[PDB]
């Protein structure tokens, strides 16, 4: 994948920053 790795770590914002 191409922005696939951008999507991916996208997912991790949303998590990492979601739980805190």
């Known amino acids: 994948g191409i922005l ?3 999507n ?3 997912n991790l914002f949303k ?3 979601g739980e805190k």
């Open 4 to 6: 696939d790795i951008k």
């Open 15 to 17: 998590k990492i920053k």
């Open 8 to 10: 991916k770590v996208s």
